[PDB]
Structure 1
Amino acid sequence: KSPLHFAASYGRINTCQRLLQDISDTRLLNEGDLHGMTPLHLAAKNGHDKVVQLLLKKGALFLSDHNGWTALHHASMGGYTQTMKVILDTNLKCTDRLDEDGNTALHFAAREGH
């Protein structure tokens, strides 16, 4: 579990492909951190386009963490447009989502100055 949360947060792709050879069981893909963060959340927060593309290719299912953020709320806060294109070109549902504080993905991309 915690090896996957470290290897996705810091872009280690080859460690992620080894840990996701058990794709018949999808518990550890959509698992949560102590802040409810998915591996899809952590890979998009630090801006890793390859890890967020591998996790979306195996069904990361676009969950939400605590404070109601998503992978697009994390990729916007940081201005990583490459992982933003991977999220946006998958489905058009995530760009209209809101957190608990009512902010969309647009509000974090403008507050940090991207």
Structure 2
Amino acid sequence: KKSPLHFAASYGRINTCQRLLQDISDTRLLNEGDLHGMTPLHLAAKNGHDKVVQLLLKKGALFLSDHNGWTALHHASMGGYTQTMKVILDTNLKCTDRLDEDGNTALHFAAREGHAKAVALLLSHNADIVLNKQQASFLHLALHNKRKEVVLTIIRSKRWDECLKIFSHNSPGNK
């Protein structure tokens, strides 16, 4: 019964997820793995279904890690879905500062893919700005992809002076 739950969470079937989660006996099926190690929290957050991820957080789910170290917030920022992002950030504030195997945060992905409202949503909250494994900030990673709107809304923000300070003086690429 694992793969029907993975399908119904990956494609936003809320009533099928309610009928599968009617029995609250075994929670190991709720936080089960995958071939790629994604629990249905990651599946519901990857495709951007806010009501499904809200139901899985109401029934109790753990912010586990991908084999690439990602979280549900990493997938919601990779897709740029602000609704699932707002649902995740209203539950636990300790999910924001989270690193993958490459050392990227969710703000790095949201700035890399050019989603302005996702960057503004993580930026209105405390985003814990940090460098990459290659000592790149999210602003560097936004500038290397010529994403005009996200660096414009970083300029229009209030935390511009904090973003301007941090960079490595030793990297030839990330100046």
Scaled by the length of structure 2, what TM-score is found? 0.63
Offset from partner CA, 1:77-111 (integer Å, 9 cap, x none): 01100000010000001100010010001011011
Question: By how many angstroms is 1:25 displaced?
Answer: 1.0
Number of aligned residue pairs: give it. 112
- The aligned counterpart of 1:97 is 98
**What SS does the aligned partner of 1:96 have?**
coil
Question: By how many angstroms is 1:33 displaced?
Answer: 1.1
Offset from partner CA, 1:21-56 (integer Å, 9 cap, x none): 121210111001111001000000000000000000
Alpha-carbon distance in 2 for matches of 1:23, 1:100: 33
Question: By how many angstroms is 1:62 displaced?
Answer: 1.0
Alpha-carbon distance in 2 for matches of 1:65, 1:111: 19
Alpha-carbon distance in 1 for matches of 2:110, 2:39: 20
Q: Stretches of 4+ moved more than 4 A in 1?
A: none
Structure 2: unaligned runs, 5 residues or longer = 114-175
Alpha-carbon distance in 1 for matches of 2:85, 2:42: 12
Q: Identity across aligned pairs (percent)?
A: 100
Larger radius of gyration: 2
Alpha-carbon distance in 1 for matches of 2:24, 2:84: 22
Alpha-carbon distance in 1 for matches of 2:63, 2:22: 20
Question: By how many angstroms is 1:65 displaced?
Answer: 1.5
Alpha-carbon distance in 2 for matches of 1:33, 1:100: 18
